[PDB]
Amino acid sequence: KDWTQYVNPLMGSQSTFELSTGNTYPAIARPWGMNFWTPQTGKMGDGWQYTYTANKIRGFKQTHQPSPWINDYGQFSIMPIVGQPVFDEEKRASWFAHKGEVATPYYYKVYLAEHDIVTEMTPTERAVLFRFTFPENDHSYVVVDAFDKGSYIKIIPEENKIIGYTTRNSGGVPENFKNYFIIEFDKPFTYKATVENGNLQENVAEQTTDHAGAIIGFKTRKGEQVNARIASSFISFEQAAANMNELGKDNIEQLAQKGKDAWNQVLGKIEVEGGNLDQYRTFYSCLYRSLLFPRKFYELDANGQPIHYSPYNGQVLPGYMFTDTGFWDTFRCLFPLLNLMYPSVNKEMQEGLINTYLESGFFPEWASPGHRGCMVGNNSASILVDAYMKGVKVDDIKTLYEGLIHGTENVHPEVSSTGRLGYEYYNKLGYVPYDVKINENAARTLEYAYDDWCIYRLAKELKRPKKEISLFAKRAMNYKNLFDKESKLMRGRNEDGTFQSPFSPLKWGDAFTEGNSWHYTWSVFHDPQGLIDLMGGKEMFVTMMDSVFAVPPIFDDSYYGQVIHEIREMTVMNMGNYAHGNQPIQHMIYLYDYAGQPWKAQYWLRQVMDRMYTPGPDGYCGDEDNGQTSAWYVFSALGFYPVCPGTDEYVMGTPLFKKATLHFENGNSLVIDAPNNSTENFYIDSMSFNGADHTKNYLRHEDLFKGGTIKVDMSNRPNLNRGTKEEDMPYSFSKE
Ligand SMILES: OC[C@@H]1[C@@H](O)[C@H](O)[C@H](O)c2nccn21
Ligand SMILES: [Ca+2]
């Protein structure tokens, strides 16, 4: 029963600065692996470390990068060569072609045309095995590149061993940051040299310098194979040596099988059938991408118990730790997918978040590996509360709540996206003003209002004092403070209470983040009825929604000074101002359900699924973003979506396959049966749940978990009478 066959690690690699089709690299890794491995086509330092259109590989690199924008840390590479012992990253490079390359989650192989070498690699969570097949040559070499900005290398010939550390990073690390690595060869060195800032030094054992490296050599027969066992650690060499045991004594074939098994274990929790090969590939590739971030950032001590280097305070402490995710992205549906299908994994992650707070003073928003300045909002609140409300409960609930309250009245002194920038204005006025030097003020307000509803939900659940509950119940309505009755849109508001003038609904950034008013107005996840009312009723609301799709993709880009890829991605799509390639508008289509018109959602969701996702190297319509854009497709292909994390609800869309089966960790299974599904039959004519007629526009977490069968009768005509009743509507705070 194999699903890995459908996973294309190359999907999203054909991307540029100007137009993203994913901005991914081939992550050769275990699910949520501490260390990822990738072929490297880019130069050292370039966020675009692998691009499909590149012709040369120059190394096989350990990487932790979550995006080309955030860039990398804990990074070093290995490169087999023939002829001269050359360290230079250009001179050592080799031409290759994609037809000479095999990429899967558990195994990567490539043929290096300028050296006549085959490279294979199979990783575990923290370690990896390389196998190099060399040609007949007197002078065959392996290059180890510890990268620049301060590193260390040491050759240990009595053990066919090279060790070292790397420090090049992109911010967000303590002063003592190091990644310690160990490499063991099965073949003795006949040549050895370390490299000091590009200068080759034969029989010198050790370097401590800006850019350290090593070159070892030997004679090879035709087809002779040399294996290299590699592990790394954020704690020490001794711990890197312990991590190495993950490999046991396995060879390439045995480790590949183990990795294939670990991926089939997780991918196979969702079985789809009755689709075409494009759909299978697109689905499972998206699922693979949803099971990578945040990465494990903990290691195992001698008793098999988790310990971690703190990317927050630089100490080595007990317990879980994860990193490399921006909650601004992944609150939306990535983490919800974990709460539905992988709750035991999120349990580890949530414990890790308690540790971020204890070690740093704040919950993270963007972490890579420590706090990084990027995006907006206080959406850790959604993550933390959603997990708790769906039965993923940390040990220390006391600290959990305190951490949440802390975030509402503090901003990190060095990292402005950590905590709530503008909390003082927000707490006092009910919004962050447009004219007080706090950029992206309207986006901050709207997301905080939602984050406060999340806190309200937990405070109520925890039976906090009525005063606290009331405060957050009030703050949750702060989205009303930026609604402009005249345009029916959200609008920047001045400190004096006047609306910002002149108002451009089509202007990106400024008051908003990477979007305009037409994208951000819909950010009222917890109260769509409230928004419906603000607009003057469901008919007007639907009119506003339809117009998003109907207009040209005209924009105003003056806040950025250039057509950023996010805007360009939107212009080429021919779907009006529906900017699906970015996060803010991603839940929007599901809002049709709340207005009593689910057939419109069914239509537009099928459009997006068919057109905006392809399984090739240019498969996405914009940045993939650590699982968010991928997990969107996974949920939407299943036929539902967590519009409002922190509720128990999944809002109905339209399924893509004829059959889908979910295998929950509790041992129950759900069958979603849509036997008449096709390219033409994308409307839901009727639905039943275990025999009972089901006309509601939503499904509940605990009902899903019980198991059984959902039957969906597909049709090529919209049913105008189903899901229009009040009791069919999903949750709105205003009705509560
Ligand atoms: O990757 C960092 C952030 C993302 O978290 C976010 O999705 C945003 O769209 C974006 N554009 C460029 C970089 N970023
Ligand atoms: Ca994005």
Coordinates of N, CA and C in Angstrom, one line a residue, residues 54-159:
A54 N 18.0 25.5 -13.0 CA 19.5 25.5 -12.9 C 20.1 24.3 -13.5
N55 N 21.4 24.4 -13.9 CA 22.0 23.3 -14.6 C 23.1 22.6 -13.8
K56 N 23.5 23.1 -12.7 CA 24.6 22.6 -11.9 C 24.3 22.4 -10.5
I57 N 24.8 21.3 -9.9 CA 24.8 21.0 -8.5 C 26.2 21.2 -8.0
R58 N 26.3 21.8 -6.8 CA 27.6 22.2 -6.3 C 27.8 21.6 -4.8
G59 N 26.8 20.9 -4.3 CA 26.8 20.3 -3.1 C 25.5 19.6 -2.7
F60 N 25.6 18.8 -1.7 CA 24.5 18.1 -1.1 C 24.5 18.7 0.4
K61 N 23.4 19.4 0.7 CA 23.4 20.3 1.8 C 22.4 20.0 2.9
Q62 N 22.9 20.0 4.1 CA 22.0 20.0 5.3 C 21.5 21.4 5.4
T63 N 20.1 21.5 5.6 CA 19.4 22.8 5.6 C 18.2 22.8 6.6
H64 N 17.9 24.0 7.0 CA 16.7 24.2 7.9 C 15.7 25.2 7.4
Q65 N 16.0 25.7 6.2 CA 15.3 26.9 5.6 C 13.8 26.7 5.5
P66 N 13.0 27.6 6.1 CA 11.5 27.5 5.9 C 11.0 28.3 4.6
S67 N 11.8 29.2 4.1 CA 11.5 29.9 2.9 C 12.7 30.7 2.4
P68 N 12.8 31.0 1.1 CA 13.9 31.7 0.6 C 14.1 33.2 1.2
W69 N 13.0 33.7 1.8 CA 13.0 35.0 2.4 C 13.6 35.0 3.8
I70 N 13.2 34.0 4.5 CA 13.7 33.8 5.9 C 15.1 33.3 5.9
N71 N 15.5 32.6 4.8 CA 16.8 32.0 4.6 C 17.1 31.0 5.6
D72 N 18.4 30.6 5.8 CA 18.8 29.4 6.4 C 19.7 29.5 7.7
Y73 N 19.9 28.4 8.4 CA 20.9 28.3 9.5 C 21.2 26.8 9.7
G74 N 22.3 26.5 10.5 CA 22.7 25.1 10.7 C 23.0 24.4 9.4
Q75 N 23.9 25.0 8.6 CA 24.1 24.6 7.2 C 25.5 24.3 6.8
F76 N 25.6 23.1 6.2 CA 26.9 22.6 5.7 C 26.7 21.7 4.5
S77 N 27.7 21.4 3.7 CA 27.5 20.6 2.5 C 28.7 19.6 2.2
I78 N 28.4 18.6 1.4 CA 29.3 17.6 1.0 C 29.3 17.5 -0.5
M79 N 30.4 17.2 -1.2 CA 30.4 17.1 -2.6 C 31.5 16.2 -3.2
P80 N 31.1 15.1 -3.9 CA 32.1 14.2 -4.5 C 32.6 14.8 -5.8
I81 N 33.9 14.6 -6.0 CA 34.6 15.2 -7.3 C 35.7 14.2 -7.7
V82 N 36.2 14.5 -8.9 CA 37.2 13.7 -9.5 C 38.2 14.6 -10.3
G83 N 39.5 14.3 -10.3 CA 40.5 15.1 -11.0 C 41.3 15.9 -10.0
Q84 N 41.1 17.2 -9.9 CA 41.9 18.1 -9.0 C 41.1 18.3 -7.7
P85 N 41.9 18.4 -6.6 CA 41.2 18.7 -5.3 C 40.9 20.2 -5.3
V86 N 39.7 20.6 -5.7 CA 39.2 22.0 -5.8 C 38.0 22.2 -4.8
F87 N 38.2 23.2 -3.9 CA 37.2 23.6 -2.9 C 36.2 24.6 -3.5
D88 N 36.6 25.5 -4.3 CA 35.8 26.6 -4.8 C 34.3 26.1 -5.2
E89 N 33.3 26.8 -4.8 CA 31.9 26.3 -5.0 C 31.5 26.4 -6.5
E90 N 32.2 27.2 -7.3 CA 31.9 27.2 -8.7 C 32.7 26.1 -9.4
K91 N 34.0 26.0 -9.1 CA 34.8 25.1 -9.9 C 34.5 23.6 -9.6
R92 N 33.9 23.3 -8.4 CA 33.6 21.9 -8.1 C 32.3 21.4 -8.6
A93 N 31.5 22.4 -9.2 CA 30.1 22.1 -9.6 C 30.1 21.1 -10.8
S94 N 28.9 20.4 -10.9 CA 28.7 19.6 -12.1 C 27.4 19.8 -12.7
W95 N 27.4 19.8 -14.1 CA 26.1 19.7 -14.8 C 25.4 18.4 -14.4
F96 N 24.0 18.5 -14.4 CA 23.2 17.4 -14.3 C 21.9 17.6 -15.1
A97 N 21.0 16.6 -15.3 CA 19.7 16.8 -15.8 C 18.7 16.1 -15.0
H98 N 17.4 16.6 -15.0 CA 16.3 16.0 -14.3 C 16.0 14.5 -14.6
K99 N 16.3 14.2 -15.9 CA 16.2 12.8 -16.3 C 17.2 11.9 -15.7
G100 N 18.3 12.5 -15.1 CA 19.3 11.8 -14.4 C 19.2 11.9 -12.9
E101 N 18.0 12.2 -12.5 CA 17.7 12.5 -11.1 C 16.4 11.8 -10.6
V102 N 16.5 11.2 -9.4 CA 15.4 10.6 -8.8 C 15.2 11.2 -7.4
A103 N 14.1 11.9 -7.2 CA 13.8 12.6 -6.0 C 12.5 12.0 -5.3
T104 N 12.6 11.5 -4.1 CA 11.4 11.1 -3.3 C 11.7 11.6 -1.9
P105 N 10.6 11.6 -1.0 CA 10.8 12.1 0.4 C 11.9 11.3 1.1
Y106 N 12.1 10.0 0.8 CA 13.0 9.2 1.6 C 14.3 8.9 0.9
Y107 N 14.5 9.3 -0.3 CA 15.6 8.9 -1.2 C 15.9 9.9 -2.3
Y108 N 17.1 10.3 -2.5 CA 17.5 11.2 -3.6 C 18.7 10.6 -4.2
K109 N 18.7 10.5 -5.6 CA 19.8 10.1 -6.4 C 20.0 11.0 -7.6
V110 N 21.2 11.3 -7.9 CA 21.5 12.1 -9.1 C 22.8 11.7 -9.7
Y111 N 22.9 11.8 -11.0 CA 24.1 11.6 -11.8 C 24.8 12.9 -12.2
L112 N 26.0 13.0 -11.7 CA 26.8 14.2 -11.9 C 27.7 14.1 -13.1
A113 N 27.3 14.8 -14.2 CA 27.8 14.6 -15.5 C 29.3 15.0 -15.7
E114 N 29.8 16.0 -14.9 CA 31.2 16.4 -15.1 C 32.2 15.6 -14.3
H115 N 31.7 14.8 -13.4 CA 32.6 14.0 -12.6 C 32.4 12.4 -12.8
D116 N 31.4 12.1 -13.5 CA 31.0 10.7 -13.7 C 30.7 10.0 -12.3
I117 N 30.0 10.7 -11.5 CA 29.7 10.2 -10.1 C 28.2 10.1 -9.9
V118 N 27.7 9.0 -9.3 CA 26.3 8.9 -8.9 C 26.3 9.1 -7.4
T119 N 25.4 10.1 -6.9 CA 25.2 10.3 -5.5 C 23.8 9.9 -5.1
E120 N 23.8 9.1 -4.0 CA 22.5 8.7 -3.4 C 22.5 9.2 -1.9
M121 N 21.3 9.5 -1.4 CA 21.2 9.8 0.1 C 19.8 9.5 0.7
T122 N 19.9 8.9 1.9 CA 18.7 8.5 2.6 C 18.8 9.0 4.0
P123 N 17.9 9.9 4.4 CA 18.1 10.5 5.8 C 17.2 9.8 6.8
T124 N 17.6 9.9 8.1 CA 16.6 9.8 9.2 C 16.2 11.2 9.7
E125 N 15.7 11.2 10.9 CA 15.3 12.5 11.5 C 16.5 13.5 11.7
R126 N 17.6 12.9 12.1 CA 18.8 13.8 12.5 C 20.0 13.4 11.7
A127 N 20.0 12.3 11.0 CA 21.2 11.8 10.4 C 20.9 11.4 8.9
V128 N 21.9 11.0 8.2 CA 21.8 10.6 6.7 C 22.9 9.7 6.3
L129 N 22.6 8.9 5.3 CA 23.6 8.1 4.7 C 23.8 8.5 3.2
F130 N 25.0 8.8 2.8 CA 25.4 9.0 1.5 C 26.1 7.8 0.8
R131 N 25.8 7.5 -0.4 CA 26.6 6.5 -1.2 C 27.1 7.1 -2.5
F132 N 28.4 7.2 -2.7 CA 28.9 7.7 -3.9 C 29.5 6.6 -4.7
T133 N 29.0 6.5 -6.0 CA 29.5 5.6 -6.9 C 30.6 6.3 -7.8
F134 N 31.8 6.0 -7.6 CA 32.9 6.6 -8.3 C 33.4 5.9 -9.6
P135 N 33.9 6.7 -10.6 CA 34.5 6.0 -11.8 C 36.0 5.6 -11.5
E136 N 36.6 4.8 -12.4 CA 38.0 4.5 -12.3 C 38.8 5.7 -12.3
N137 N 39.6 6.0 -11.3 CA 40.4 7.2 -11.1 C 41.4 7.1 -10.0
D138 N 42.6 7.6 -10.3 CA 43.7 7.7 -9.3 C 43.3 8.8 -8.3
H139 N 42.6 9.8 -8.7 CA 42.3 11.0 -7.9 C 40.8 11.3 -7.7
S140 N 40.1 10.5 -6.8 CA 38.8 10.8 -6.4 C 38.7 11.4 -5.0
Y141 N 37.8 12.5 -4.9 CA 37.7 13.2 -3.6 C 36.3 13.4 -3.1
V142 N 36.2 13.7 -1.8 CA 35.0 14.2 -1.2 C 35.3 15.5 -0.5
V143 N 34.5 16.6 -0.8 CA 34.6 17.9 -0.3 C 33.6 18.1 0.8
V144 N 34.0 18.6 2.0 CA 33.2 19.0 3.1 C 33.3 20.5 3.3
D145 N 32.2 21.2 3.2 CA 32.1 22.6 3.2 C 31.3 23.1 4.5
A146 N 32.0 23.6 5.4 CA 31.4 24.0 6.7 C 30.7 25.4 6.6
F147 N 30.8 26.0 5.4 CA 30.2 27.4 5.2 C 31.0 28.5 5.9
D148 N 30.6 29.8 5.7 CA 31.4 30.9 6.2 C 30.8 31.5 7.5
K149 N 31.2 32.8 7.8 CA 30.8 33.5 9.0 C 31.2 32.9 10.3
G150 N 32.3 32.1 10.2 CA 32.8 31.5 11.4 C 32.5 30.0 11.5
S151 N 33.5 29.1 11.2 CA 33.3 27.7 11.3 C 34.6 26.9 11.7
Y152 N 34.5 25.6 11.8 CA 35.5 24.7 12.3 C 35.5 23.4 11.6
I153 N 36.7 22.8 11.3 CA 36.8 21.5 10.7 C 38.0 20.8 11.3
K154 N 37.9 19.5 11.4 CA 39.0 18.6 11.9 C 38.9 17.2 11.3
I155 N 40.0 16.8 10.6 CA 40.1 15.5 10.0 C 40.7 14.5 11.1
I156 N 40.1 13.3 11.2 CA 40.6 12.3 12.1 C 40.9 11.0 11.3
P157 N 42.1 10.9 10.8 CA 42.4 9.8 9.8 C 42.3 8.4 10.5
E158 N 42.6 8.3 11.8 CA 42.6 7.0 12.5 C 41.2 6.5 12.6
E159 N 40.2 7.3 12.2 CA 38.8 6.8 12.3 C 38.0 7.1 11.0

